[PDB]
């Protein structure tokens, strides 16, 4: 994948988005996500993986102050609420709009309308890895029919009977929690489903085309290295597109087969 | 025993120099007592009213369905003043009321209110305006049947 074609695509997509919005103007140009589209020869996964994978970016996402983050932890919620209120930095304290544990989530958000209200009240959901396997049943298809606001895994367990939540929380140190939360908020998300298509939010239209180029390129290397089986022999097509724009191909393959075994005489 | 434990915790809070609201939480209970429930219905604070079917004297509750209809309160007549007493730790309760519940039970309360409205009130809307009683005894019914078949044959 040559970087010049991608960065040329960055100017072209941004110019088209701006001239389409011109037909507030600045608010319309802003908050418009940029989607990198993976097309593979086969299904990227054999089943629906409901925990998104994190790809670290040089230019992090969700850096705006208006983004509200809901953090779901294990019991008790009081310890993490006190940690947010006292031992967190001010930017993260302003960004985190809700701290709720799994027990209170199952109690107060069993209703579908309650789940939809929780879905609409926040933008980014982070979830402790000790309880993230129970969140599909707690949040239903409201959070998992769309891959946009699926709970991002965070690690809050202290790395090594029934644990009493009041007596012990079994948590890693607070600066490590802060670093993990910042990393997970800034990371980009990849979602694995039995499909030939995978869409990744890499940036916004108001960003600079070089930052789009860098973010797209690092998403390309980490995604093909980690989450794509059979590496580049599975890779068919790479596109960049917006919510309403067309797809600009930045990489198109030369062989349409996985290997020579697919070709039979 | 629960009230004694709560008062002990509040006494410790006062001793350490804190308000009792700092240690105790706002309670949510089933409201009971006939005068209290009638006052709540008149102030339109009650969300659901359950009225015992066997109150003697009946005048204590004979106005209460009409009061609930005037105030737009969902009500239901239920079997057992002793059954309501088991809710309120008494031998007998003439009437109980729900005003507000916790957030985890708001959906259940709304579903119960809708279930009462659709399955009790709409069904008894026409039957509540009719007269009761007037049933004959067994021998009187048999005599009347013999009389009407005799008249039909003759």
């Amino acid at each position: 994948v040559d970087p010049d074609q991608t960065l040329k695509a960055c100017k072209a997509l941004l110019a088209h988005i701006k001239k389409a919005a011109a037909a507030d103007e600045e608010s319309t140009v802003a908050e418009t996500p940029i989607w990198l589209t993976l097309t593979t020869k086969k299904h990227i996964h054999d089943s629906h993986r409901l925990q998104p994978g994190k790809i670290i970016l040089p230019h992090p996402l969700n850096t705006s102050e208006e983004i509200s983050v809901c953090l779901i932890t294990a019991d008790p919620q009081r310890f993490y609420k006190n940690a947010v209120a006292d031992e967190f930095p001010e930017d993260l304290r302003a960004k985190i709009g809700r701290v709720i544990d799994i027990s209170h989530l199952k109690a107060k958000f069993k209703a579908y309308e309650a789940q939809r209200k929780l879905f609409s009240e926040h933008d980014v959901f982070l979830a402790d890895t000790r309880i993230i396997n129970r969140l599909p049943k707690a949040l239903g298809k409201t959070f998992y029919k769309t891959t946009t606001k699926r709970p991002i895994p965070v690690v809050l367990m202290a790395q090594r009977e029934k644990r009493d939540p009041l007596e012990n929380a079994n948590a890693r140190p607070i600066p490590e929690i802060v670093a993990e939360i910042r990393k997970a908020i800034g990371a980009a998300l990849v979602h694995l489903s039995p499909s030939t298509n995978t869409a990744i939010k890499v940036g916004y239209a108001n960003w600079e085309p070089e930052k789009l180029a860098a973010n797209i390129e690092t998403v390309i290397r980490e995604l093909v290295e980690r989450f794509v089986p059979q590496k580049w022999q599975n890779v068919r097509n790479f596109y960049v597109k917006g919510p309403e724009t067309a797809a600009l191909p930045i990489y198109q393959t030369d062989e349409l087969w996985l290997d020579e075994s697919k070709v039979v005489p | 025993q629960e009230k004694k434990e709560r008062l002990l915790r509040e006494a410790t809070a006062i001793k350490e120099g804190k308000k009792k609201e700092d240690v105790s939480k706002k309670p949510y209970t089933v409201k009971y007592g006939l005068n209290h429930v009638v006052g709540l219905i008149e102030n339109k604070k009650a969300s659901l009213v359950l009225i015992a079917n066997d109150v003697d004297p009946i005048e204590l509750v004979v106005f209460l369905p009409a009061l609930c209809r005037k105030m737009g309160i969902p009500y239901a007549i239920i079997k057992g003043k002793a059954r309501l007493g088991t809710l309120v730790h008494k031998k007998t309760a003439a009437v109980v009321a729900i005003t507000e519940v916790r957030s985890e039970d708001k959906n259940e309360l709304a579903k119960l209110i809708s279930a009462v409205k659709e399955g009790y009130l709409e069904k008894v809307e026409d039957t509540r305006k009719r007269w009761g009683g007037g049933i004959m005894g067994f021998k009187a019914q048999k005599r009347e049947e013999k009389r009407k078949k005799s008249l039909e044959t003759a």
Binding site: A114 | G39, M71, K106, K111
Partner: peptide
């Protein structure tokens, strides 16, 4: 708001009746 809260708080248009002013 919630439809459950609307269902719980739904009343009629007749104004409330109070025995006295309360604190």
């Amino acid at each position: 708001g919630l439809k459950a809260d609307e269902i719980i708080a739904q009343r009629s248009a007749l104004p409330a009746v109070s025995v006295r002013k309360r604190a």
